[PDB]
Structures are given as structure tokens and as C-alpha cells.
Amino acid sequence: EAPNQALLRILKETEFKKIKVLGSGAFGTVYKGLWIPEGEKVKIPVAIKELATSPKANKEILDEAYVMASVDNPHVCRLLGICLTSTVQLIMQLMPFGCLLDYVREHKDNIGSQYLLNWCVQIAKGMNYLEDRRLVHRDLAARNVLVKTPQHVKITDFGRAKVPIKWMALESILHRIYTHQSDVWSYGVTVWELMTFGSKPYDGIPASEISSILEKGERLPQPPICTIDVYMIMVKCWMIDADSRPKFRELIIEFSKMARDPQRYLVIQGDERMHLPSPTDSNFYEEDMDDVVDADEYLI
Numbered sequence: 001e002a003p004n005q006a007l008l009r010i011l012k013e014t015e016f017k018k019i020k021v022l023g024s025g026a027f028g029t030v031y032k033g034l035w036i037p038e039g040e041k042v043k044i045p046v047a048i049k050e051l052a053t054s055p056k057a058n059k060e061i062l063d064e065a066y067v068m069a070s071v072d073n074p075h076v077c078r079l080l081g082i083c084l085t086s087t088v089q090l091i092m093q094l095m096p097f098g099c100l101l102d103y104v105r106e107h108k109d110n111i112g113s114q115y116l117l118n119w120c121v122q123i124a125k126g127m128n129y130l131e132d133r134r135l136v137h138r139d140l141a142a143r144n145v146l147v148k149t150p151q152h153v154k155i156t157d158f159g160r161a162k163v164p165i166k167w168m169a170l171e172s173i174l175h176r177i178y179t180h181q182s183d184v185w186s187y188g189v190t191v192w193e194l195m196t197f198g199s200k201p202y203d204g205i206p207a208s209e210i211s212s213i214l215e216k217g218e219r220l221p222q223p224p225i226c227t228i229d230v231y232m233i234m235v236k237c238w239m240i241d242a243d244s245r246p247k248f249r250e251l252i253i254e255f256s257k258m259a260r261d262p263q264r265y266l267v268i269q270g271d272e273r274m275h276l277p278s279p280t281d282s283n284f285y286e287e288d289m290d291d292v293v294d295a296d297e298y299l300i
């Protein structure tokens with residue numbers, strides 16, 4: 001097929017500074033940082049993900065990098081570059097408000113229907129792009145959707161892109177089959193996560209039981225804020241026949257239609273009176289903010 005002409009950027013350790021830690025785990029550790037390229041006279045807010053040095057773990061992060069450098073869409077997290085140190089580190093865009101899952105939990109009181117439906121449109125768009133780029137995500141969830149601004153979210157975590165049981169289609173659990181329509185199932189679950197303001201799908205139920213539960217016809221419940229219209233979409237994403245499930249281009253259309261009249265499709269008490277930070281807020285954006293540009297505007 002088509003040759004992947006993507007440019008992998010190698011960045012000097014000296015070109016950027018680690019400010020603080022955003023999160024630590026098995027993988028290694030993610031840092032908040034700043035990147036000052038050559039003599040460009042720009043500071044770019046970044047997220048630096050670094051890995052003990054074991055040759056197998058380096059192969060895995062270099063696979064994640066391959067995919068992350070291969071994307072270019074406004075609702076997908078691109079790889080800005082890699083830095084070849086003793087450890088090896090991925091340089092990514094800083095998503096100041098972190099993951100969407102924590103965002104919905106921490107801000108339910110100010111999250112209205114417009115935001116929820118717009119997020120749904122945005123994820124369906126990012127996913128539809130991955131489909132265009134013949135890419136299967138294999139790990140879609142509200143944890144792998146990051147918040148740039150409350151009005152702008154992006155799909156990330158290409159560690160699996162070519163197990164998270166409670167997000168997986170039936171075929172994926174029983175036959176290890178992953179299609180674009182299997183991503184649609186995880187899209188349905190992500191939407192559920194948002195509509196419930198961050199609830200754990202199948203709370204209490206052990207991963208082993210899930211397979212049988214789904215086989216019986218059981219599915220995640222209707223969130224209180226959901227109209228039949230919205231839940232009916234979520235349910236279509238969880239059909240046994242993957243070809244029956246909606247396509248991402250349809251999901252874009254469906255949520256977009258609904259985002260034009262959010263109150264008709266999501267019933268939230270206090271809606272419209274609620275407000276989240278915007279680039280039109282006082283002090284929305286620590287050192288020298290003098291020449292800071294966002295990565296989405298920095299293009300060599």
C-alpha cells in the first residue's frame with residue numbers, strides 16, 4: 001500500500017526543560033515541560049513521556065512513536081518528536097486539563113449538554129480520521145481522550161494501535177478480533193463514561209463475567225441525563241453484528257444534529273447557567289509567557 005512519508009523528529013535534550021511531574025506509572029513517568037527550538041524565539045508547552053533501560057520496553061515506546069508521528073488531525077494527539085537519551089523520551093503536546101474521565105468527575109457541576117455532545121462529535125471525528133488512515137486504536141476510553149481546552153478534546157494512547165475488557169467488543173474478547181467497528185463499541189462505552197460523569201462501566205462485575213453477561217444480551221444502563229435518542233445510539237454501538245453498529249461518519253452526523261439543540265437530547269438540571277474556562281477568561285493561560293505558542297500553531 002501507500003508509503004508512510006511521516007517525519008520523525010530528533011530533539012536535543014538541551015532544546016527542552018522538565019518543569020514538574022504530571023503522572024507516574026509502569027511505563028515510566030510523564031512530565032510537564034517547555035520546548036525552546038533552536039533560535040526560533042518560541043516556548044512550546046509539552047508533555048515529556050520517558051521510560052530502567054530494557055531493550056524490549058524501548059521497542060514498545062518506539063512502536064507507539066511510529067504511530068503517533070503518523071497522525072495529523074485536530075482530534076488526535078500527534079508526536080512532536082523523540083529525544084534519544086540513555087532512557088528515550090516522547091515529546092507530545094501539553095493537554096493542560098488532563099484526561100476527559102477525570103475532567104467529567106472533577107467538573108460535573110459545570111458540564112452542560114453542549115459540551116458533552118460537542119465532545120462526542122469531536123471523538124467521532126478523531127476516530128473517523130484514524131479509520132481514513134486505516135488505523136485501529138484497540139484502546140478507546142475516556143481515559144485516552146485528553147483535554148486541550150474544555151471546548152477541545154483529542155484521542156491519544158497508541159500503545160495498542162495496530163487488555164481493557166469492559167471497553168471491548170464481543171469478537172475482541174472471545175476471538176481477539178479488532179476491527180474499526182470494534183472501535184465503535186469502545187466509542188459507545190466512552191460516551192457512556194461521559195454521560196454518567198465518569199462512572200466505572202460494570203462496577204463490581206469481574207472482567208471474567210463480562211464475556212458471558214454480554215452474550216446474554218445485558219448492556220450498560222441508560223444514564224439519567226440520556227434521552228432515548230442518545231441511549232439508542234449507545235445501544236447500536238453494542239450490537240453483536242459489528243456491521244450493524246454505526247459508522248464513525250454517521251456518529252459525527254448524529255451527535256452534530258443533536259449538538260444544535262442540546263437540551264432536547266440531554267436533560268441536566270442547571271444546564272446553560274453552567275460555565276467552564278475559555279480562552280476568553282482572565283488568566284486562562286508561570287515563568288515567561290512572552291513567546292509561548294501552542295504546538296498546534298508551531299509548524300516547521
Ligand SMILES: COC1CCN(c2nccc(Nc3cc4c(cn3)ncn4C3CCCC3)n2)CC1
Pocket residue numbers: 022023024027030046047049077092093094095096097098099146156157158
Ligand atoms: C501512558 O503514557 C502516555 C501516552 C500518551 N499520553 C499523551 N499523549 C499526548 C499528549 C499528552 N499530553 C498530556 C498528558 C497529560 C497531561 C498533559 N498533557 N496531564 C496529564 N496527562 C496524563 C499523563 C500523566 C497522567 C495523565 N499525553 C499521555 C500518557
